[PDB]
Design an enzyme around this catalytic site. Structure first.
Site, PDB file in Angstrom:
ATOM      1  N   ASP A  27      36.015  52.135  23.599  1.00 37.06           N
ATOM      2  CA  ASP A  27      36.164  52.875  22.408  1.00 37.06           C
ATOM      3  C   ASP A  27      35.325  52.251  21.138  1.00 37.06           C
ATOM      4  O   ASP A  27      35.346  50.974  21.476  1.00 37.06           O
ATOM      5  CB  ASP A  27      37.383  53.099  21.985  1.00 37.06           C
ATOM      6  CG  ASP A  27      38.245  53.601  23.274  1.00 37.06           C
ATOM      7  OD1 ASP A  27      38.445  53.070  24.904  1.00 37.06           O
ATOM      8  OD2 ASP A  27      39.158  54.903  23.250  1.00 37.06           O
ATOM      9  N   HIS A  66      35.962  54.440  17.568  1.00 38.67           N
ATOM     10  CA  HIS A  66      36.501  54.777  17.034  1.00 38.67           C
ATOM     11  C   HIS A  66      35.932  54.806  15.533  1.00 38.67           C
ATOM     12  O   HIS A  66      37.122  54.590  14.219  1.00 38.67           O
ATOM     13  CB  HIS A  66      37.682  54.569  17.047  1.00 38.67           C
ATOM     14  CG  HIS A  66      39.142  55.300  18.408  1.00 38.67           C
ATOM     15  ND1 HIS A  66      38.668  56.668  18.231  1.00 38.67           N
ATOM     16  CD2 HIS A  66      39.095  55.340  19.551  1.00 38.67           C
ATOM     17  CE1 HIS A  66      39.602  56.969  19.266  1.00 38.67           C
ATOM     18  NE2 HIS A  66      39.049  56.321  20.087  1.00 38.67           N
ATOM     19  N   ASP A 112      35.014  57.798  23.367  1.00 42.45           N
ATOM     20  CA  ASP A 112      35.528  58.058  22.029  1.00 42.45           C
ATOM     21  C   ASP A 112      35.141  57.245  20.836  1.00 42.45           C
ATOM     22  O   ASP A 112      34.870  56.007  20.883  1.00 42.45           O
ATOM     23  CB  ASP A 112      37.448  56.514  22.793  1.00 42.45           C
ATOM     24  CG  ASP A 112      37.726  58.165  22.994  1.00 42.45           C
ATOM     25  OD1 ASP A 112      37.684  58.700  23.545  1.00 42.45           O
ATOM     26  OD2 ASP A 112      38.998  57.443  22.924  1.00 42.45           O
ATOM     27  N   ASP A 166      36.794  59.826  16.053  1.00 43.34           N
ATOM     28  CA  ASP A 166      38.290  60.993  15.216  1.00 43.34           C
ATOM     29  C   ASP A 166      39.102  58.893  15.279  1.00 43.34           C
ATOM     30  O   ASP A 166      38.671  57.029  15.675  1.00 43.34           O
ATOM     31  CB  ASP A 166      38.952  60.954  16.620  1.00 43.34           C
ATOM     32  CG  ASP A 166      39.158  62.553  16.373  1.00 43.34           C
ATOM     33  OD1 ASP A 166      39.200  62.963  16.007  1.00 43.34           O
ATOM     34  OD2 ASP A 166      38.999  62.368  18.138  1.00 43.34           O
ATOM     35  N   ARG A 167      40.618  58.816  14.161  1.00 42.47           N
ATOM     36  CA  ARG A 167      40.935  57.432  13.911  1.00 42.47           C
ATOM     37  C   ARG A 167      40.202  57.133  12.928  1.00 42.47           C
ATOM     38  O   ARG A 167      40.549  56.549  11.885  1.00 42.47           O
ATOM     39  CB  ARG A 167      41.158  56.907  14.944  1.00 42.47           C
ATOM     40  CG  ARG A 167      42.261  57.213  16.056  1.00 42.47           C
ATOM     41  CD  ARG A 167      43.436  57.029  15.421  1.00 42.47           C
ATOM     42  NE  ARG A 167      44.447  58.299  16.304  1.00 42.47           N
ATOM     43  CZ  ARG A 167      44.712  57.991  17.598  1.00 42.47           C
ATOM     44  NH1 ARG A 167      43.897  57.503  17.863  1.00 42.47           N
ATOM     45  NH2 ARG A 167      45.210  58.733  17.847  1.00 42.47           N
ATOM     46  N   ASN A 220      38.829  61.182  25.864  1.00 39.94           N
ATOM     47  CA  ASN A 220      39.089  61.946  25.662  1.00 39.94           C
ATOM     48  C   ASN A 220      38.908  62.530  23.950  1.00 39.94           C
ATOM     49  O   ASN A 220      39.846  63.261  23.975  1.00 39.94           O
ATOM     50  CB  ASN A 220      40.142  61.077  26.183  1.00 39.94           C
ATOM     51  CG  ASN A 220      40.803  60.545  25.478  1.00 39.94           C
ATOM     52  OD1 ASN A 220      40.597  59.364  25.130  1.00 39.94           O
ATOM     53  ND2 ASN A 220      42.575  60.474  24.443  1.00 39.94           N
ATOM     54  N   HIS A 221      38.340  61.485  23.178  1.00 41.51           N
ATOM     55  CA  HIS A 221      38.251  62.532  21.731  1.00 41.51           C
ATOM     56  C   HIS A 221      37.021  63.332  21.984  1.00 41.51           C
ATOM     57  O   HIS A 221      36.706  63.551  20.159  1.00 41.51           O
ATOM     58  CB  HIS A 221      38.454  61.088  20.999  1.00 41.51           C
ATOM     59  CG  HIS A 221      39.309  60.796  20.410  1.00 41.51           C
ATOM     60  ND1 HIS A 221      40.750  60.946  19.274  1.00 41.51           N
ATOM     61  CD2 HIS A 221      41.037  59.715  21.126  1.00 41.51           C
ATOM     62  CE1 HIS A 221      42.035  60.651  19.036  1.00 41.51           C
ATOM     63  NE2 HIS A 221      42.051  59.634  20.383  1.00 41.51           N
ATOM     64  N   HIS A 250      36.088  56.640  31.217  1.00 43.04           N
ATOM     65  CA  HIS A 250      36.599  56.333  29.800  1.00 43.04           C
ATOM     66  C   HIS A 250      37.839  55.804  30.562  1.00 43.04           C
ATOM     67  O   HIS A 250      38.757  55.429  29.868  1.00 43.04           O
ATOM     68  CB  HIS A 250      36.500  57.508  28.719  1.00 43.04           C
ATOM     69  CG  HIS A 250      37.610  57.534  27.649  1.00 43.04           C
ATOM     70  ND1 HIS A 250      37.047  56.237  26.833  1.00 43.04           N
ATOM     71  CD2 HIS A 250      38.991  57.736  27.346  1.00 43.04           C
ATOM     72  CE1 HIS A 250      38.400  56.326  25.810  1.00 43.04           C
ATOM     73  NE2 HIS A 250      39.105  57.288  25.996  1.00 43.04           N
ATOM     74  N   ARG A 258      51.080  59.730  28.415  1.00 45.95           N
ATOM     75  CA  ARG A 258      50.492  60.528  27.161  1.00 45.95           C
ATOM     76  C   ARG A 258      50.583  62.543  27.433  1.00 45.95           C
ATOM     77  O   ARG A 258      50.252  63.245  26.953  1.00 45.95           O
ATOM     78  CB  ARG A 258      49.091  60.137  27.813  1.00 45.95           C
ATOM     79  CG  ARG A 258      48.042  58.823  27.355  1.00 45.95           C
ATOM     80  CD  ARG A 258      47.101  58.855  27.368  1.00 45.95           C
ATOM     81  NE  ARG A 258      46.927  57.632  27.622  1.00 45.95           N
ATOM     82  CZ  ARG A 258      46.240  56.783  26.836  1.00 45.95           C
ATOM     83  NH1 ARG A 258      45.983  57.894  25.264  1.00 45.95           N
ATOM     84  NH2 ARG A 258      45.799  55.522  26.938  1.00 45.95           N
ATOM     85  N   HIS A 280      39.417  53.194  26.997  1.00 46.24           N
ATOM     86  CA  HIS A 280      40.970  54.496  26.880  1.00 46.24           C
ATOM     87  C   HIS A 280      41.961  53.540  26.138  1.00 46.24           C
ATOM     88  O   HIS A 280      43.125  54.196  25.796  1.00 46.24           O
ATOM     89  CB  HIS A 280      41.082  54.508  27.795  1.00 46.24           C
ATOM     90  CG  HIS A 280      41.990  56.277  27.567  1.00 46.24           C
ATOM     91  ND1 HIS A 280      42.276  57.153  26.742  1.00 46.24           N
ATOM     92  CD2 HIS A 280      42.827  56.206  28.510  1.00 46.24           C
ATOM     93  CE1 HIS A 280      43.305  58.253  27.347  1.00 46.24           C
ATOM     94  NE2 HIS A 280      43.485  57.767  28.246  1.00 46.24           N
TER      95      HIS A 280
END
Ligand SMILES: O=C(O)[C@@H]1[C@H](C(=O)O)[C@H]2CC[C@@H]1O2
Ligand SMILES: [Zn+2]
Ligand SMILES: [Zn+2]
EC number: 3.1.3.16
Length: 315
Positions: free
Chosen positions: A67, A69, A96, A99-100, A128-129, A177, A225, A252
């Site tokens: 990831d 991010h 990923d 995001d963040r 997932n993002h 991922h 989750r 992840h």
């Protein structure tokens, strides 16, 4: 506007170097160059199988990152540490990208630009993002609307829906991922047939590939989750046996050292976002594999300085 321009409407290697410097200095790629990248990268990604199948010859290598991010300046550090992507320095980034972190736009446009420049050697998988749900909440949508428009965002959202979901190197290593599945019996052929150009569903293989996590104990558990499950070593071993694979690589989850190797060696986590959200204090890693020996080699690294923009400032 005196910023990076495409040459004959197309990405080249000076364009990418100009973009990286431009972005390091915190400027914006003109909206029409951005648009041209997005619509050309949708075209590239929409011809790919859901499962990318890559062959690494014996003197070839590939780097796998997890990831990232929106941590653009750490992405630049990976390229300084490991060299720019090229036909001889292939990369896979395992989902990923956004995001963040608050430089998601800079990350995604650089990776898209490299996917255009070296489409056979620079690989992006969905995480997932790369989803509308997540982006609405965790920063990306707010960031694309502050810098461009709601429209540009919808275009991002559509490009992401065509990002392949897994990649298999030499019929022996599979990279996704999230991780493996909430039901036994999934094959590589089933993955190849997932119709991926959608927001993920709530359950089922496409959801598992982006959301699932390994657990140490044998069995499957309900995920904390709230989606997919946790799969134990008996899950990995049956999956690897049926598909004739050696091990999988996923991302992840944050890890203090940037990597972990669970399930006796069969399930590897790589995470490439050091001092995640400016707080976790963790290290990051990427992995090298080579055709003559596909066992992972990990290379660790720590966070570099970036501009004073807080994580999630755009949420
Ligand atoms: O990558 C992470 O650190 C977290 C988890 C992941 O699913 O990869 C996810 C939710 C927030 C972040 O993205
Ligand atoms: Zn994830
Ligand atoms: Zn993540």
């Amino acid at each position: 506007y005196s910023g990076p321009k495409l040459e004959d409407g197309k990405v080249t290697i000076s364009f990418m170097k100009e973009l990286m410097q431009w972005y390091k200095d915190q400027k914006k790629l003109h909206r029409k160059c951005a648009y041209q990248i997005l619509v050309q990268v949708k075209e590239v990604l929409s011809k790919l199988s859901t499962l990318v199948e890559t062959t690494l010859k014996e003197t070839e290598k590939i780097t796998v990152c997890g990831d990232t991010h929106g941590q653009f300046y750490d992405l630049l550090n990976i390229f300084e540490l490991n060299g720019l992507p090229s036909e001889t320095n292939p990369y896979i980034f395992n989902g990923d990208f956004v995001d963040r972190g608050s430089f998601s736009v800079e990350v995604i446009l650089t990776l898209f630009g490299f996917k255009l420049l070296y489409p056979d050697h620079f690989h992006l998988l969905r995480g997932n993002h790369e989803t509308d749900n997540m982006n609405q909440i965790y920063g990306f949508e707010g960031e694309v609307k502050a810098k461009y428009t709601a429209q540009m965002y919808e275009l991002f959202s559509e490009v992401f829906e065509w990002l392949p979901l897994a990649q298999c190197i030499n019929g022996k290593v599979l990279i996704m991922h999230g991780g493996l599945f909430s039901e036994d019996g999934v094959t590589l052929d089933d993955i190849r047939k997932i119709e991926r150009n959608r927001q993920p569903p709530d359950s089922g293989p496409m959801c598992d590939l982006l959301w699932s996590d390994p657990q140490p104990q044998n069995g499957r558990s309900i995920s904390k989750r709230g989606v997919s499950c946790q799969f134990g070593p008996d899950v990995t071993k049956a999956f690897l046996e049926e598909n004739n694979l050696d091990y999988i690589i996923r991302s992840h989850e944050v890890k203090a050292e940037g990597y972990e190797v669970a399930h006796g060696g069969r399930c590897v986590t790589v995470f490439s976002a050091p001092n995640y959200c400016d707080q976790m204090g963790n290290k990051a890693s990427y992995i090298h594999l080579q055709g003559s020996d596909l066992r992972p080699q990990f290379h660790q690294f720590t966070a570099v300085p970036h501009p004073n923009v807080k994580p999630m400032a755009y949420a």
